[PDB]
Amino acid sequence: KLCSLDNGDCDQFCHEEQNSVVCSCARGYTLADNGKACIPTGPYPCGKQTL
Amino acid sequence: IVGGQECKDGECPWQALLINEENEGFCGGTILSEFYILTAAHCLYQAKRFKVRVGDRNTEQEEGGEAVHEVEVVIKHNRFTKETYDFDIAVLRLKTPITFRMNVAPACLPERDWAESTLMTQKTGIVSGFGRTHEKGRQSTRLKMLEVPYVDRNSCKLSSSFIITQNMFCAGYDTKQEDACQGDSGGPHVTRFKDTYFVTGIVSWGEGCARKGKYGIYTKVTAFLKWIDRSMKTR
Ligand SMILES: O=C1CN(S(=O)(=O)/C=C/c2ccc(Cl)cc2)CCN1CC1CCN(c2ccncc2)CC1
Numbered sequence: 001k002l003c004s005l006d007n008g009d010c011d012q013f014c015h016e017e018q019n020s021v022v023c024s025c026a027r028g029y030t031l032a033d034n035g036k037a038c039i040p041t042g043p044y045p046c047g048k049q050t051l
Numbered sequence: 052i053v054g055g056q057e058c059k060d061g062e063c064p065w066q067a068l069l070i071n072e073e074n075e076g077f078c079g080g081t082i083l084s085e086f087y088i089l090t091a092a093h094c095l096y097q098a099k100r101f102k103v104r105v106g107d108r109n110t111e112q113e114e115g116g117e118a119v120h121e122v123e124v125v126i127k128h129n130r131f132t133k134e135t136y137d138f139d140i141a142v143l144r145l146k147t148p149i150t151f152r153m154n155v156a157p158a159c160l161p162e163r164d165w166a167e168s169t170l171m172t173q174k175t176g177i178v179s180g181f182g183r184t185h186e187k188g189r190q191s192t193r194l195k196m197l198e199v200p201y202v203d204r205n206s207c208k209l210s211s212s213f214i215i216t217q218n219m220f221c222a223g224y225d226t227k228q229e230d231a232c233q234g235d236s237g238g239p240h241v242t243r244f245k246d247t248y249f250v251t252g253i254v255s256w257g258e259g260c261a262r263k264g265k266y267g268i269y270t271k272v273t274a275f276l277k278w279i280d281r282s283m284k285t286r
Pocket residue numbers: 134135136186213214230231232233234236254255256257258259260261266267268269
């Protein structure tokens with residue numbers, strides 16, 4: 001709980017959509033299976049500097 | 052840009068430059084996705100007919116992949132006020148999709164709350180463009196990027212000379228010669244969070260360029276999310 005402690009331990013969007021912490025990612029990213037990590041789905045996701 | 056670093060290979064891939072008929076840069080933009088570009092509403096009043104360029108870091112030496120695109124539709128904001136730079140924000144739907152490559156990718160759109168809470172409370176923020184290197188100077192061939200720190204809203208409103216509506220927020224410095232400038236308007240203002248940048252502003256306006264007792268006024272993107280969202284559904 002608490003998106004204040006450290007973004008709820010999320011890689012991105014954090015909400016207290018209930019009694020605890022709920023993570024979510026931007027469009028073009030899939031929330032990993034640890035409910036926190038954001039995994040790019042496409043070959044060129046938003047936010048990332050091209051490398 | 053006024054006194055900042057250069058955008059090295061692959062750092063400001065979400066930059067976009069609105070080009071005029073004589074093929075001169077005259078405003079900036081932000082790649083929201085393959086079909087949509089985000090810019091400042093008032094930029095549309097500076098050219099009879101323009102195009103949007105991407106993936107360009109040097110406006111002289113033809114580099115790898117810089118692509119030019121034509122505007123299908125221009126979606127200004129209903130409430131855009133000329134005299135008060137209020138509601139300075141637009142969206143451009145391109146006729147042909149954008150192919151993402153080195154120097155050409157989209158910046159992420161965040162969610163209002165989380166953004167205004169986490170993203171907007173960070174220390175600095177990045178702004179970039181091909182605008183004048185300093186006030187009375189010439190544009191700029193190289194693409195630059197400045198790390199401008201967020202400004203206190205109350206200490207912001209006080210420094211001004213014009214109302215700072217809810218659709219705005221200062222950013223920059225008191226005296227340190229560093230700030231956005233002519234030709235950057237419409238440009239992107241991004242906030243970095245865990246190696247992922249987010250659109251958090253639109254080069255709107257300022258009083259001069261990097262003047263003491265003044266800051267750069269940016270358009271508050273978080274207040275227009277739902278609007279931007281609708282626009283990217285064509286309307
Ligand atoms: O003094 C100026 C300077 N230019 S400029 O150099 O090309 C860009 C400035 C700029 C700087 C940093 C950043 Cl984040 C963004 C933009 C714009 C026009 N003027 C003249 C003024 C004229 C009156 N203005 C009002 C604003 C709101 N309400 C009423 C009036 C703003 C610009």
